[PDB]
């Protein structure tokens, strides 16, 4: 389903890893700078930001920089991932 401020199921804290699964809809407040999505589980994942960048990918071995994500509350849908994985959202 859709992902947004009405049905997010997890909230990410800046720099704090959490277990993520395909289908999750994650709230993340970016106060400034550029969004970063990082994972080291080796599980490939992809994301859509509501009203924002689409088709973001991460190999599971480092950080994906997402230019042009708004400051403020973001809603990030995990579109694809083969299994649960540990991920963190950050900004700098």
Ligand X SMILES: OC[C@H]1O[C@@H](O[C@H]2[C@H](O)[C@@H](O)[C@H](O[C@H]3[C@H](O)[C@@H](O)[C@H](O[C@H]4[C@H](O)[C@@H](O)[C@H](O[C@H]5[C@H](O)[C@@H](O)[C@H](O)O[C@@H]5CO)O[C@@H]4CO)O[C@@H]3CO)O[C@@H]2CO)[C@H](O)[C@@H](O)[C@@H]1O
Q: Provide the edge-to-edge strand list for the sheet that holds 56-58.
A: 10-11, 25-30, 72-81, 45-49, 56-58
The binder of ligand X chosen from 18, 40, 52, 64 (CB under 6 A): 40
Least distance to ligand X from the beta carbon of 33, Å? Answer: 7
State the binding partner of 40 from ligand X, Gd ion, none, CB within 5 to 8 A by kind. ligand X
Contact residues for Gd ion, defined by CB under 5 A = 51, 72-73, 82
Nearest residue to ligand X on Cβ basis: 92
Distance CA 40, CA 74 (A): 22
């Amino acid at each position: 389903a859709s992902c947004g401020s009405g049905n997010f199921n997890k909230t990410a804290a800046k720099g704090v890893e959490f277990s993520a699964v395909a289908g999750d809809c994650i709230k993340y407040n970016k106060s400034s700078g550029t969004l970063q999505i990082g994972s080291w589980t080796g599980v490939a994942s992809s994301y859509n930001i509501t009203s924002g960048p689409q088709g973001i990918t991460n190999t599971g071995n480092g950080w994906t920089t997402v230019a042009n994500a708004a400051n403020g509350d973001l809603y990030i849908k995990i579109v694809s991932a083969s299994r649960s994985f540990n991920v963190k959202f950050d900004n700098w």
